[PDB]
């Protein structure tokens, strides 16, 4: 038999994607040698399999390049040689993905996996396909887009403590639509810690922190007044700040408008992108536990706000009930759990 | 322009 040469590309091909290696395989024989150079004549690092039947590139291939593949094979019935030249995808634009939570972080039972692209994603399906989530113990999850750039992944219910999550965003070489290609791959890993659920009950005006079902702290709170009430629902703990200036204009409300404000506060834990914080409020200690006086944030005592900062972590849960407000939007950025699972699972890749 |  004369040996036969097969490749993962064809001669004269254009738009060869670089999300996978280029490979050459031999049948009815073995590969004697395979070489690959780019348009500037430099070799491409590759490796021949021990059995001599498969050759594959071992380094990242580049965008908008011309490669020349040269392969020679040997069999009982003579030798076979081929040359192939192909062109890789030429993006119109590159987009870089940013993953949360951080690599090695320990986060609460509510933490969603977040892939924030820095461009609009025309082909949401292609993005979802390039993201591999792995969980141990394995638990079901699904993708849902909060806007044109950020997509989230979470299970039907809060994470189980101790679960290990692994995220591979393999977008390099992936055509994300309208000439948009991934700039790089990202790989992160995080672990779920203790179940921390804090319930802010407007009927008692108390914020109770439960760790694995055990009450560990009770905090009088003053939430948003009737005109600017705190919305009910599930809040995900975001960032923690030793101190921060709360600026209403960050959310589109001028500081000097009737509902505006600019307040430097201590021990601030963000629980919504709309501007809700758990923070120190020494001015409302008397009101805490009795009357709502804020623009929506959970006012608590300095010591309690500091305790919250020191003992609550990213991804923990704050649940607000019995307020005169509505329900936190599901696409706030930290309100993922207010979206019904059936709607989340269905997704919105379009 | 449309990055950020
Ligand atoms: Cl080069």
Residue numbers in the entry:
A (entry chain A): 58 to 407
B (entry chain B): 1 to 4
Article passage:
The essential l,d-transpeptidase of Mycobacterium tuberculosis (LdtMt2) catalyses the formation of 3→3 cross-links in cell wall peptidoglycan and is a target for development of antituberculosis therapeutics. Whereas the d,d-transpeptidases catalyse the formation of 4→3 cross-links between peptidoglycan pentapeptide chains, the functionally related l,d-transpeptidases (Ldts) catalyse the formation of 3→3 cross-links between tetrapeptide chains. The Ldts, which do not manifest structural homology with the PBPs and likely originate from a different evolutionary precursor, share a common YkuD fold (named after the first identified member of this class), distinguished by a β-sandwich with two mixed β-sheets and one helix, and a set of four loops. The established substrate for LdtMt2 is the disaccharide tetrapeptide monomer 1 (GlcNAc-MurNAc-l-Ala-d-iGluNH2-m-DAPNH2-d-Ala).
We were interested in assessing the transpeptidase activity of the active site cysteine to serine mutant of LdtMt2 (LdtMt2C354S), in part because previous reports have shown that in contrast to wild-type LdtMt213,21, LdtMt2C354S is unable to form a covalent complex with several penem and carbapenem derivatives. When LdtMt2C354S was incubated with 1, 2, 3 or 4, no product formation was observed, suggesting the active site cysteine is essential for transpeptidase activity, and cannot be replaced by a potentially nucleophilic serine residue.
